[PDB]
């Protein structure tokens, strides 16, 4: 489960997920730093 640069892999849904959905979080996925730091 390697996915595109602006998404992370969710294990519950076995699917890759847009980082914007986690960005406002205290503890976002690491692979959403680069993308998530477009703000």
């Amino acid at each position, epitope marked *: 489960g390697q996915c595109s640069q602006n*998404e992370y892999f*969710d294990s*519950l*849904l*076995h*699917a*890759c*997920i*847009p980082c*914007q*959905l*986690r*960005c*406002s*979080s*205290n503890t*976002p996925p690491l692979t959403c730093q680069r993308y998530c730091n477009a703000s």
Partner: nanobody, 118 residues
Framework: EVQLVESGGGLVQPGGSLRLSCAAS????????MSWVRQAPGKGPEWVSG????????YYADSVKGRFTISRDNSKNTLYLQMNSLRAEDTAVYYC????????????RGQGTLVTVS
């Protein structure tokens, strides 16, 4: 505790439209981020649409922009996927899911509902 009871799948002819339901139990749909994911047989699950909990922003995969609309009815406490202008590759099991507090990880999903497009 928390459940997501889905309904609204079935058969529809190419070009048709369909409306999926995802009724929350044990929580309020308005209070969290929810999205829809789908899995066609032979393929891995695919994220499709989503509402961000923190600001109610809506998002859509490319394959589905212009045709699909996610929303919530607070009074019925359900998430919906309005699907228009359907096509053969929109055929999958559709799954709603819910995120933790403060745009957290997905913590629950519905049982699934089958959408078949001839």
């Amino acid at each position: 505790e928390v459940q997501l009871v889905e309904s609204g799948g079935g058969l529809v002819q190419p070009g048709g439209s369909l409306r999926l339901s995802c009724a929350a139990s044990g929580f309020t749909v308005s209070s969290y981020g929810m999205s829809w994911v789908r899995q066609a047989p032979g393929k891995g699950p695919e994220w499709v649409s989503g509402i961000r909990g923190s600001d109610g922003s809506t998002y859509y995969a490319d394959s589905v922009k212009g045709r699909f609309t996610i929303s919530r009815d607070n009074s019925k406490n359900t998430l919906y996927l309005q699907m228009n202008s359907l096509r053969a590759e929109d055929t999958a099991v559709y799954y709603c899911a819910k995120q933790g507090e403060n745009d957290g990880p997905f913590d629950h999903r519905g049982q699934g509902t089958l959408v078949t497009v001839s």
